[PDB]
């Protein structure tokens, strides 16, 4: 039979394996790279929640439309997707 | 003295340090800062700010939007949007790091989709004839 | 087999059920190498309408209770077909795939859903 053809099947997907592998290596640098990112938004949600705490609690006479609750009748939903898939199914589980 | 001055944006600090004199413009009076001055908070125009160190030199920021809080020994501001610089002639300046990102968002796709898709592709793709043809005897 | 001796309806029903077979067959291959997340909408429905046929296929025999001790089922081919068209009609594409295993009609198949 086209035996060649088999051995040229094998060596593609060897190479296609390698090509994964470089894909888990810059996935893993972009990981640390974005898990860096996430540390620096802290302080400034710290010291505003910290702020806007003084202020409610110097302030405590009135409430804001965002600071109050009313009955509900309709919702907005805010979702975060990829612009590309392969990455697991984050999006599925996220849509169930 | 001096007193900590911290500049920081949601996406991180852009300046922080001990400093004795600050320059800012407020949504109503325009400010000047010292430390140990009282508490104080208000919101701040979209421009530059100049702040000065103890060596005989001040720094220079520009900002656009943000609010200002102040106590004793902490001054700092909450940055809508920073930059370290001089002017807004620096505009040129933000949009290098901005298209620098926007390149790398182009490169994330033109690696992802070209390296795996592509090759993904052809792996499945003739199997078929072998997975039949195995115990072929003739 | 040709819709001039079975009947339309049956030769219709018979060359449907065939290519969701073969169109899975083809299918087989990308979900050991992908995800069957990282295939359209209908692909899934097709996956498992397929699955749920090769359950039904399995029919208990009235000689092979010397194996299991189960009963044999000689089901009418009018009980078949209907079971068939609504699967097909995927009236069912909310059951269990053990609901249709080693079972007699679709209505063996709707009772042991229940059982379930």
């Known amino acids: 039979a086209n035996?060649?053809?088999?051995?040229?099947?094998?060596?593609?997907?060897?190479?296609?394996?390698?090509?994964?592998?470089?894909?888990?290596?810059?996935?893993?640098?972009?990981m640390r790279r974005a898990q860096e990112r996430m540390a620096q938004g802290r302080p400034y949600a710290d010291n505003?929640?910290?702020?806007?705490?003084?202020?409610?609690?110097?302030?405590?006479?009135?409430?804001?439309?965002?600071?109050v609750d009313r009955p509900v009748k309709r919702v907005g939903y805010i979702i975060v997707s990829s612009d590309r898939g392969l990455a697991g199914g984050l999006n599925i589980n996220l849509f169930k | 003295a001096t007193m900590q001055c911290d500049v920081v944006s949601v996406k991180e600090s852009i300046y922080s340090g001990a400093?004795?004199?600050?320059?800012?413009?407020?949504?109503?009076?325009?400010?000047?800062?010292?430390?140990?001055?009282?508490?104080?908070?208000?919101?701040?125009?979209?421009?530059?700010?100049?702040?000065?160190?103890?060596?005989?030199?001040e720094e220079i920021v520009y900002v656009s939007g943000g609010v200002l809080e102040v106590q004793p020994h902490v001054v700092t501001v909450l940055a809508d949007t920073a930059?370290?610089?001089?002017?807004?002639?620096?505009?040129?300046?933000?949009?290098?790091?901005?298209?620098?990102?926007?390149?790398?968002?182009?490169?994330?796709?033109?690696?992802?989709?070209?390296?795996?898709?592509?090759?993904?592709?052809?792996?499945?793709?003739?199997?078929?004839?072998?997975?039949?043809?195995?115990?072929?005897?003739? | 087999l040709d819709p001039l001796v079975v009947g339309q309806e049956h030769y219709e029903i018979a060359r449907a059920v065939q290519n969701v077979l073969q169109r899975y067959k083809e299918l087989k291959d990308i979900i050991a190498i992908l995800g069957m997340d990282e295939l359209?909408?209908?692909?899934?429905?097709?996956?498992?309408?397929?699955?749920?046929?090769?359950?039904?296929?399995?029919?208990?025999?009235?000689?092979?209770?010397?194996?299991?001790?189960?009963?044999?089922?000689?089901?009418?081919?009018?009980?078949?077909?209907?079971?068939?068209?609504?699967?097909?009609?995927?009236?069912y594409d909310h059951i269990p795939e053990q609901a249709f295993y080693m079972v007699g009609g679709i209505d063996e198949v709707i009772a042991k859903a229940e059982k379930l």
Do not use: C
Request: glycine letters at 6%.
């Open chain 3, 40 to 91: 359209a909408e209908e692909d899934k429905l097709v996956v498992y309408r397929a699955r749920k046929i090769q359950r039904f296929f399995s029919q208990p025999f009235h000689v092979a209770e010397v194996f299991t001790g189960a009963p044999g089922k000689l089901v009418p081919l009018k009980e078949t077909i209907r079971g068939f068209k609504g699967l097909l009609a995927g009236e």
């Open chain 2, 19 to 57: 400093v004795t004199m600050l320059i800012a413009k407020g949504a109503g009076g325009e400010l000047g800062i010292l430390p140990g001055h009282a508490p104080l908070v208000t919101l701040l125009q979209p421009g530059p700010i100049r702040v000065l160190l103890e060596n005989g030199t």
């Open chain 1, 48 to 67: 505003m929640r910290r702020v806007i705490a003084h202020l409610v609690q110097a302030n405590p006479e009135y409430k804001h439309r965002y600071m």
């Open chain 2, 83 to 138: 930059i370290r610089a001089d002017n807004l002639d620096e505009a040129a300046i933000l949009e290098a790091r901005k298209n620098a990102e926007q390149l790398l968002a182009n490169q994330k796709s033109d690696l992802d989709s070209a390296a795996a898709l592509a090759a993904l592709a052809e792996t499945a793709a003739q199997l078929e004839t072998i997975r039949k043809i195995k115990n072929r005897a003739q």
């Open chain 1, 3 to 30: 035996l060649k053809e088999i051995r040229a099947k094998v060596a593609s997907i060897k190479s296609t394996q390698k090509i994964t592998r470089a894909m888990q290596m810059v996935a893993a640098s972009k």
